[PDB]
CSV table of C-alpha atoms in Angstrom, one decimal:
chain,number,residue,atom,x,y,z
A,52,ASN,CA,-1.0,-23.8,-23.0
A,53,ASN,CA,0.5,-21.7,-20.1
A,54,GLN,CA,4.0,-20.2,-19.7
A,55,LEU,CA,5.4,-18.2,-16.7
A,56,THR,CA,6.4,-14.9,-18.4
A,57,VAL,CA,8.4,-13.2,-15.5
A,58,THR,CA,7.6,-9.4,-15.4
A,59,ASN,CA,8.6,-6.4,-13.0
A,60,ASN,CA,6.1,-3.9,-11.6
A,61,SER,CA,6.2,-0.7,-9.4
A,62,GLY,CA,3.3,-0.2,-7.1
A,63,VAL,CA,1.4,-1.1,-4.0
A,64,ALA,CA,-1.5,-3.5,-3.3
A,65,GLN,CA,-3.7,-5.2,-0.6
A,66,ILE,CA,-5.5,-8.6,-1.0
A,67,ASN,CA,-9.3,-8.6,0.1
A,68,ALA,CA,-10.4,-10.0,3.5
A,69,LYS,CA,-12.5,-12.8,1.7
A,70,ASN,CA,-9.5,-14.0,-0.4
A,71,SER,CA,-8.0,-17.4,-1.4
A,72,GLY,CA,-4.6,-16.7,0.3
A,73,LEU,CA,-0.9,-15.9,-0.5
A,74,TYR,CA,0.8,-18.0,-3.2
A,75,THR,CA,4.3,-18.9,-2.0
A,76,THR,CA,4.9,-20.3,-5.6
A,77,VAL,CA,3.3,-19.3,-9.0
A,78,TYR,CA,2.3,-23.0,-9.6
A,79,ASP,CA,0.8,-22.7,-6.0
A,80,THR,CA,1.0,-25.1,-3.1
A,81,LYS,CA,-2.2,-24.1,-1.0
A,82,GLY,CA,-2.5,-20.2,-1.1
A,83,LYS,CA,-2.7,-19.6,2.7
A,84,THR,CA,-4.6,-16.7,4.4
A,85,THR,CA,-2.3,-14.1,6.2
A,86,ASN,CA,-2.2,-10.5,7.6
A,87,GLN,CA,-2.5,-9.0,4.0
A,88,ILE,CA,-6.3,-9.3,4.0
A,89,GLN,CA,-6.7,-5.5,3.4
A,90,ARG,CA,-3.2,-4.6,4.5
A,91,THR,CA,-1.3,-2.7,1.9
A,92,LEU,CA,2.5,-3.5,1.7
A,93,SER,CA,4.1,-2.9,-1.7
A,94,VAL,CA,4.3,-4.7,-5.2
A,95,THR,CA,7.9,-5.3,-6.3
A,96,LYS,CA,7.1,-7.7,-9.3
A,97,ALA,CA,4.1,-8.9,-11.3
A,98,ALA,CA,4.4,-12.0,-13.7
A,99,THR,CA,1.7,-14.0,-15.5
A,100,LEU,CA,1.7,-17.9,-15.6
A,101,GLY,CA,-0.2,-18.0,-18.9
A,102,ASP,CA,-3.5,-16.2,-18.0
A,103,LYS,CA,-3.0,-16.3,-14.1
A,104,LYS,CA,-1.6,-12.8,-13.2
A,105,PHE,CA,0.4,-13.1,-10.0
A,106,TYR,CA,1.3,-9.9,-8.0
A,107,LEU,CA,4.5,-10.3,-5.9
A,108,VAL,CA,4.0,-8.6,-2.6
A,109,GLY,CA,7.0,-7.2,-0.7
A,110,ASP,CA,8.1,-5.3,2.4
A,111,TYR,CA,6.4,-2.0,3.1
A,112,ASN,CA,9.5,0.1,2.3
A,113,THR,CA,12.2,-2.3,0.8
A,114,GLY,CA,10.1,-4.7,-1.2
A,115,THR,CA,11.5,-7.9,0.5
A,116,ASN,CA,9.9,-10.8,-1.2
A,117,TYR,CA,6.8,-12.4,0.7
A,118,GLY,CA,5.2,-14.2,-2.2
A,119,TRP,CA,2.8,-14.0,-5.2
A,120,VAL,CA,-1.1,-13.7,-5.2
A,121,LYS,CA,-3.9,-13.9,-7.9
A,122,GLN,CA,-5.3,-10.8,-9.7
A,123,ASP,CA,-9.0,-12.0,-8.9
A,124,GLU,CA,-8.6,-11.6,-5.1
A,125,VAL,CA,-6.4,-8.4,-5.0
A,126,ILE,CA,-6.9,-4.6,-5.2
A,127,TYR,CA,-3.8,-3.5,-7.1
A,128,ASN,CA,-2.9,0.3,-6.9
A,129,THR,CA,-0.2,1.9,-9.2
A,130,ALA,CA,2.6,4.1,-7.9
A,131,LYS,CA,4.7,7.0,-9.4
A,132,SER,CA,7.8,9.0,-8.5
A,133,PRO,CA,7.2,10.6,-5.0
A,134,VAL,CA,7.2,14.4,-4.6
A,135,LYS,CA,9.1,16.5,-2.1
A,136,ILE,CA,7.4,19.6,-0.3
A,137,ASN,CA,8.6,20.8,3.2
A,138,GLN,CA,5.6,23.1,3.5
A,139,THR,CA,4.1,22.8,6.9
A,140,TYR,CA,0.3,22.8,7.1
A,141,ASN,CA,-2.1,22.0,10.1
A,142,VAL,CA,-3.6,18.5,10.2
A,143,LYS,CA,-7.4,18.2,10.8
A,144,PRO,CA,-8.1,17.0,14.3
A,145,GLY,CA,-9.4,13.3,14.5
A,146,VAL,CA,-7.3,12.3,11.4
A,147,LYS,CA,-5.9,8.7,11.5
A,148,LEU,CA,-2.4,8.4,10.2
A,149,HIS,CA,-1.5,5.4,8.2
A,150,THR,CA,1.8,3.4,8.2
A,151,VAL,CA,1.8,2.6,4.4
A,152,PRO,CA,0.6,4.5,1.2
A,153,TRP,CA,-3.2,3.9,0.3
A,154,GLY,CA,-3.5,3.2,4.1
A,155,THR,CA,-6.1,0.4,4.7
A,156,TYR,CA,-7.9,-0.8,7.8
A,157,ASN,CA,-4.7,-2.7,8.8
A,158,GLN,CA,-2.2,0.1,8.4
A,159,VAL,CA,-2.7,2.7,11.3
A,160,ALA,CA,0.5,4.7,12.2
A,161,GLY,CA,-1.5,6.9,14.7
A,162,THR,CA,-4.5,9.4,15.2
A,163,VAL,CA,-4.7,13.2,16.1
A,164,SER,CA,-6.7,14.6,19.0
A,165,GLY,CA,-10.5,14.9,18.2
A,166,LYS,CA,-10.4,18.7,18.7
A,167,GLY,CA,-7.0,20.4,18.4
A,168,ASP,CA,-5.1,21.1,15.1
A,169,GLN,CA,-1.5,19.7,15.3
A,170,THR,CA,1.4,21.1,13.3
A,171,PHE,CA,1.9,18.7,10.4
A,172,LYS,CA,5.3,19.2,8.6
A,173,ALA,CA,5.3,17.3,5.3
A,174,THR,CA,8.8,16.3,4.2
A,175,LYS,CA,7.6,13.9,1.3
A,176,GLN,CA,4.6,13.0,-0.8
A,177,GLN,CA,3.7,9.8,-2.6
A,178,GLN,CA,1.6,9.5,-5.7
A,179,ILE,CA,-0.4,6.2,-5.6
A,180,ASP,CA,-3.5,5.2,-7.6
A,181,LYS,CA,-6.0,8.2,-7.3
A,182,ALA,CA,-5.0,9.1,-3.7
A,183,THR,CA,-2.0,11.3,-2.9
A,184,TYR,CA,-0.6,10.3,0.7
A,185,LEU,CA,1.8,12.9,2.1
A,186,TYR,CA,4.5,11.9,4.6
A,187,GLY,CA,5.6,13.9,7.7
A,188,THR,CA,5.9,13.9,11.5
A,189,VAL,CA,3.0,14.3,14.2
A,190,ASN,CA,4.4,14.2,17.8
A,191,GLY,CA,7.1,11.6,17.5
A,192,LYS,CA,5.0,9.5,15.0
A,193,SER,CA,5.7,9.6,11.3
A,194,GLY,CA,3.4,8.3,8.6
A,195,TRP,CA,1.3,8.7,5.4
A,196,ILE,CA,-1.9,10.9,5.3
A,197,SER,CA,-4.0,11.6,2.1
A,198,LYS,CA,-4.4,15.4,1.2
A,199,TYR,CA,-8.1,14.9,1.8
A,200,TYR,CA,-7.3,14.2,5.5
A,201,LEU,CA,-4.8,17.1,5.6
A,202,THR,CA,-6.2,20.8,6.1
A,203,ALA,CA,-5.1,23.4,3.5
């Protein structure tokens, strides 16, 4: 017996490169491969059709519905209330800025000069699963950067 128990969820996720695909419906049609093959966007919803855990992926910021996907093939990462510090640090030179929290191989906002510390003003922070990606501005670009990339 299976039943679509529809449930909400606040987090982010990326589906693996060697996936089945993205499930436009929970009953599925085909599950088609797309850009989300280690591209983090956001998780707006997460229901279970019986045992089958489907994570609804949405727009990076707004959470605009793109479709569901199986738990087997995803890396789901939780999120919490963001933090605000305006404390300006220097960013380590060579650091690659990421467009979305968790910041996978298909989320690059930019990169800093190999040798040359740039003034990174943080205006925001995001608490995602394990990693804390801060947000700020580096020479016209704006994006997320883990505290492990950022110099203290």
